Amino acid sequence: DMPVERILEAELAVEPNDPVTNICQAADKQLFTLVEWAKRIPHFSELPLDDQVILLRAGWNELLIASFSHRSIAVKDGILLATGLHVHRNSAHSAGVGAIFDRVLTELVSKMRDMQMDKTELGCLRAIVLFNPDSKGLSNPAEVEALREKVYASLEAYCKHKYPEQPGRFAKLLLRLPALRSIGLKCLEHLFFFKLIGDTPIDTFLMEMLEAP
Amino acid sequence: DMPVERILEAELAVEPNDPVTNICQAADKQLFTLVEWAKRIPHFSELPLDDQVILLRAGWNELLIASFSHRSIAVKDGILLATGLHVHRNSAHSAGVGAIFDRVLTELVSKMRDMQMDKTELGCLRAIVLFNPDSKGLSNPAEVEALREKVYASLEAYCKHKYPEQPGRFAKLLLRLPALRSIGLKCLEHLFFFKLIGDTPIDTFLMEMLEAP
Amino acid sequence: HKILHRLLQD
Amino acid sequence: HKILHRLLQD
């Protein structure tokens, strides 16, 4: 089974200077929370430890981007980090990351706010991203797929129930994943330049995710 | 209205050495076909000429990648170009593009073959990609969105009708778009290195798509 | 810019 | 490799 109730539980259970330093700081901090969040997802812990690692290494960037995007829907022209510091449009632009920051605001944060995406819908979307069968190295790509399918079956149902008014609400949720994939890649690239130039402190767990497959 | 019948018409109306040279050659060739294909899409030609340009410049790479992926479902470990030349796993690997080529085979070509995605479903997906409201510069982002919504309303209906057996078939179609976005970015990067190094001939229309926004 | 604009004008 | 493996083992 794949109950939408326990997915939201996973989301609830994990609720709590220089923009870039704060960003690297908050990303390392949230990586611990992501592990705990992942374990509270149905059928996840019952996957072989090696594939749990592969999925978490494949999706961590998009999973964290989704979280702070939804977290910032009640914020004007800026994002709320997990450390508790706000990063606004000007501060990010003055840091040299205004472009990718703007994409997050328009393609993600604003779109979430304007459809009033709830924590259940956010939860399912992050579960769909976590259960990525395209991930290379999986011992059982078919089973991950089986789990993803059961996530968006439960999500479509919840939508048609909770929002019977909106018949395309289910499709609108899934069609944010392309932008999320796109934004994740660009954010990741920004993260790599930081590490390479190495003038920004990068703590150990974040450092571990940025190193070779 | 947004009839699935005319979308398939758009798809039908446009049916017809060194791997990389052939690839650049076929991509320029197909860019002309893409324009004609685009015009045969409902409500497209009625958009302001400037936004038609923006949408076509935003999506051309993914739109062309979708086409030859579906075209190659009846091919073993390789892709069928529009020029008519096959590029197989070894030839692409010997060209230095085996990685991105493998991603296309597993994430796209195989997935299309194994769900037996039809030309109507392919058509709608390419229409959804064409009607991208996230595209920067659009004079009316809301109207493009309105058209995209009417594309995947017609697609969900067609699926539930043509494949009532498969309730998650609609969601399986949309969840290939993340991979398509991801693969497009990497292919585009490969295209840029070609142009920069400039040892591979690049014809004028392809050359035009690779130049500044 | 122009090749695309031309083709769309028909 | 290990920080992730540890945390998953609980």
Ligand SMILES: C=CCc1cccc(-c2cc(/C=C/C(=O)O)ccc2O)c1
């Ligand atoms: C908003 C865009 C700026 C940016 C640039 C590079 C990386 C990130 C990034 C930040 C986080 C922070 C997590 C949190 O506080 O919740 C996570 C992943 C990222 O790629 C953001």
Ligand SMILES: C=CCc1cccc(-c2cc(/C=C/C(=O)O)ccc2O)c1
């Ligand atoms: C299959 C992957 C190799 C590769 C590498 C770089 C670019 C492309 C590419 C090819 C086409 C060809 C069009 C066609 O023949 O239908 C279009 C876009 C691309 O990014 C492929």
